[PDB]
Amino acid sequence: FQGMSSKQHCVKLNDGHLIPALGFGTYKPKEVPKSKSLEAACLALDVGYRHVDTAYAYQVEEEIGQAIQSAIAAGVVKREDLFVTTKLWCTCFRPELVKPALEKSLKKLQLDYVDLYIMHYPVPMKSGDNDFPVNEQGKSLLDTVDFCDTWERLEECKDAGLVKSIGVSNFNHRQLERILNKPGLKYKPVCNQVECHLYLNQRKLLDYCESKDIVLVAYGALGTSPVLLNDPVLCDVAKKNKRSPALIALRYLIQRGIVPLAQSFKENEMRENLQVFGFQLSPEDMKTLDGLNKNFRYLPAEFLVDHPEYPFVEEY
Numbered sequence: 001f002q003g004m005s006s007k008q009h010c011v012k013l014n015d016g017h018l019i020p021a022l023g024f025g026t027y028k029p030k031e032v033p034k035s036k037s038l039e040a041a042c043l044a045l046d047v048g049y050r051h052v053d054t055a056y057a058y059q060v061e062e063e064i065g066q067a068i069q070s071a072i073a074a075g076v077v078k079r080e081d082l083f084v085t086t087k088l089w090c091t092c093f094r095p096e097l098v099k100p101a102l103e104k105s106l107k108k109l110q111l112d113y114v115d116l117y118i119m120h121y122p123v124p125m126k127s128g129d130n131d132f133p134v135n136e137q138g139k140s141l142l143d144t145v146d147f148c149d150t151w152e153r154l155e156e157c158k159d160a161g162l163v164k165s166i167g168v169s170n171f172n173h174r175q176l177e178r179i180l181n182k183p184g185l186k187y188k189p190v191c192n193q194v195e196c197h198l199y200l201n202q203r204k205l206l207d208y209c210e211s212k213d214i215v216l217v218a219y220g221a222l223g224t225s226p227v228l229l230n231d232p233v234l235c236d237v238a239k240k241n242k243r244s245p246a247l248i249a250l251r252y253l254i255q256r257g258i259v260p261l262a263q264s265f266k267e268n269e270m271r272e273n274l275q276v277f278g279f280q281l282s283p284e285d286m287k288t289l290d291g292l293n294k295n296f297r298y299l300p301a302e303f304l305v306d307h308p309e310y311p312f313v314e315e316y
């Protein structure tokens with residue numbers, strides 16, 4: 001199966017590197033065993049995914065690294081043709097913890113570098129082994145760490161060669177401006193990975209990111225409360241184009257310059273999602289899909305809401 005590499009469909013990042021225009025997500029729900037994460041990642045590489053997105057906090061970096069190593073040994077893919085993203089977690093935002101956390105991720109992934117390393121959120125939490133520290137009342141134990149101070153250490157990780165590109169996740173407009181306007185900035189973020197789909201289409205944040213050559217990367221692209229995939233207008237557009245609702249929802253994002261992370265644990269859905277480059281939506285259908293926006297956030301990260309940098313109070 002032909003690999004969907006940057007050679008096929010890529011987006012140019014503002015540091016010169018290329019990211020494949022469709023990624024494979026690896027968020028693992030509670031109910032899904034880690035053996036299924038490994039199986040799904042192996043199949044994704046087999047059927048042609050080359051952009052693999054993971055995170056320390058998903059707890060499956062080991063399994064993703066095993067899938068990558070087994071695919072390379074089998075001759076499915078070479079390392080230079082893969083684009084691997086992982087993420088720095090809130091409990092390691094203190095500057096002195098950034099590079100050790102990256103090296104820990106690299107060891108778990110069995111990689112010498114990642115293509116993209118991003119701050120998972122703009123909000124830090126208390127350092128320690130627990131990824132979700134709380135007090136007796138269940139409130140999150142937060143920290144005070146300027147994300148610009150954390151950003152400087154991601155810049156150092158890039159200069160050390162441990163990561164090719166650096167970016168952020170779940171930042172809002174004001175927070176991106178803080179990085180872009182920080183004194184002595186070395187590298188702009190190449191991306192802002194956010195929840196984005198037909199019911200939260202991020203038009204305002206996308207406009208801003210485009211104006212700064214920052215790529216918007218979408219998770220929750222199929223809607224993760226209303227069920228996006230059952231939307232009657234979406235399903236009418238799907239029927240008109242002879243494609244599935246999921247493929248319309250992904251194509252909507254692709255045509256707006258967004259890099260979606262598509263994920264399934266079902267092999268047939270993985271392969272279906274790769275067909276997103278085989279059709280395009282008319283301007284009329286894109287306008288119809290624009291009209292579905294609800295500004296509805298399925299993933300509001302409520303565990304961070306007490307912190308002043310909680311990103312989702314502001315309009316964008």
Ligand SMILES: Nc1ncnc2c1ncn2[C@@H]1O[C@@H]2COP(=O)(O)O[C@H]3[C@@H](O)[C@H](n4cnc5c(N)ncnc54)O[C@@H]3COP(=O)(O)O[C@H]2[C@H]1O
Pocket residue numbers: 025027029219220221222223224244246247261262263264265269270272273299
């Ligand atoms: N071609 C196709 N036809 C029909 N259905 C299809 C399909 N391709 C995928 N799907 C289904 O769409 C569901 C939602 O995908 P989405 O990427 O929006 O949403 C993803 C992911 O973005 C979201 N999620 C939840 N918490 C998250 C977090 N903390 N970080 C990132 N993602 C999170 O949870 C979902 C996990 O994926 P999961 O496989 O359980 O659930 C998938 C999968 O069951």
